[PDB]
Design a protein around this ligand. Structure first.
Ligand SMILES: CN(C)c1cccc2c(S(=O)(=O)NCCCCCCCCCCC(=O)O)cccc12
Ligand SMILES: [Mg+2]
Length: 131
């Protein structure tokens, strides 16, 4: 369902989201153009996600509901879990620097992967299409 290669198509309020997350105006400008590709593979509860962008090419492996660490592109550490809630992946992370929650949701709406992000009151969306 999520299992596919997804290339970002458009985003909503992502600049304010990034600015709230502490991203400087130079990397925000770049990020508007990051060309984020997610390649998601699922086996039962074990997921592999290859994130490719104009910043980096990494692979993140996680299990549903097993807390893991993930470094953002500026080296900010997140600690948290992904879960399945009905049809959605639910991400509950905290930054380990200030403990503030970064909550996120992946859902398929039609043929788009829609990822919502919420951080300190600011909500953004990134929408992906199949490659
Ligand atoms: C290169 N630099 C400096 C950056 C560019 C653009 C955005 C950046 C964000 S951000 O917070 O605004 N956007 C990224 C948020 C990702 C949060 C998702 C957490 C879920 C972990 C994903 C693991 C997986 O793929 O399953 C944070 C830190 C650095 C950023
Ligand atoms: Mg992401």
């Amino acid at each position: 369902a999520f299992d596919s290669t997804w290339k970002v198509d458009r985003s909503e309020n992502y600049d304010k989201f990034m600015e709230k997350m502490g991203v400087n105006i130079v990397k925000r400008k770049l990020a508007a153009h990051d060309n984020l590709k997610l390649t998601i593979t699922q086996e039962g509860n074990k997921f592999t996600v290859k994130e490719s962008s104009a910043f980096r090419n990494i692979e993140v492996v996680f299990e549903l509901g097993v807390t893991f660490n993930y470094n953002l592109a500026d080296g900010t550490e997140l600690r948290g879990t992904w879960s399945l809630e009905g049809n959605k992946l639910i991400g509950k992370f905290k930054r380990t620097d200030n403990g503030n929650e970064l909550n996120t949701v992946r859902e398929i709406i039609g043929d788009e992967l829609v990822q919502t992000y919420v951080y300190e009151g600011v909500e953004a969306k990134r929408i992906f299409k199949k490659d």
